From Swiss-Prot:
<dbReference type="GO" id="GO:0005125">
    <property type="term" value="F:cytokine activity"/>
</dbReference>
<dbReference type="GO" id="GO:0030335">
    <property type="term" value="P:positive regulation of cell migration"/>
</dbReference>
<keyword id="KW-0325">Glycoprotein</keyword>
<dbReference type="GO" id="GO:0045348">
    <property type="term" value="P:positive regulation of MHC class II biosynthetic process"/>
</dbReference>
<dbReference type="GO" id="GO:0150079">
    <property type="term" value="P:negative regulation of neuroinflammatory response"/>
</dbReference>
<dbReference type="GO" id="GO:0042092">
    <property type="term" value="P:type 2 immune response"/>
</dbReference>
<feature type="glycosylation site" description="N-linked (GlcNAc...) asparagine">
    <location>
        <position position="38"/>
    </location>
</feature>
<dbReference type="GO" id="GO:0048295">
    <property type="term" value="P:positive regulation of isotype switching to IgE isotypes"/>
</dbReference>
<keyword id="KW-0075">B-cell activation</keyword>
<dbReference type="GO" id="GO:0000122">
    <property type="term" value="P:negative regulation of transcription by RNA polymerase II"/>
</dbReference>
<dbReference type="GO" id="GO:0005136">
    <property type="term" value="F:interleukin-4 receptor binding"/>
</dbReference>
<comment type="similarity">
    <text>Belongs to the IL-4/IL-13 family.</text>
</comment>
<dbReference type="GO" id="GO:1901857">
    <property type="term" value="P:positive regulation of cellular respiration"/>
</dbReference>
<dbReference type="GO" id="GO:0050728">
    <property type="term" value="P:negative regulation of inflammatory response"/>
</dbReference>
<dbReference type="GO" id="GO:0097028">
    <property type="term" value="P:dendritic cell differentiation"/>
</dbReference>
<dbReference type="GO" id="GO:0008203">
    <property type="term" value="P:cholesterol metabolic process"/>
</dbReference>
<dbReference type="GO" id="GO:2001171">
    <property type="term" value="P:positive regulation of ATP biosynthetic process"/>
</dbReference>
Amino acid sequence: HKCDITLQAIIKTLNSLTEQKTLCTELTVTDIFAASKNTTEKETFCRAATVLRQFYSHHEKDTRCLGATAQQFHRHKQLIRFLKRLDRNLWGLAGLNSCPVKEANQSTLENFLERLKTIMREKYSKCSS
């Protein structure tokens, strides 16, 4: 379950998420990676899934992100869709719903996703020859 193909599904979505820019990828999320100690692997996924869920739940209908042009509106919806897909996979990996996030530092969504991608790519690396 640890080196499950789900790792690839998460990476694929993160690749799409970071090659896509929005009017709000600069808005912030709690930096769960600002901890001088990321707990167990499952706990890290639960925390990442938690911060992303509050982000898309709070910005799906945000006037700052909805967009003026058809293209902006499309990218917004696309972003929300990808976040939900990423979140779904993370919760699946976490096998946990109740996890505390105490970090004060706020990082832009964009930087948070790049960081998560790095971590995910590392897991993939540790799983393969």
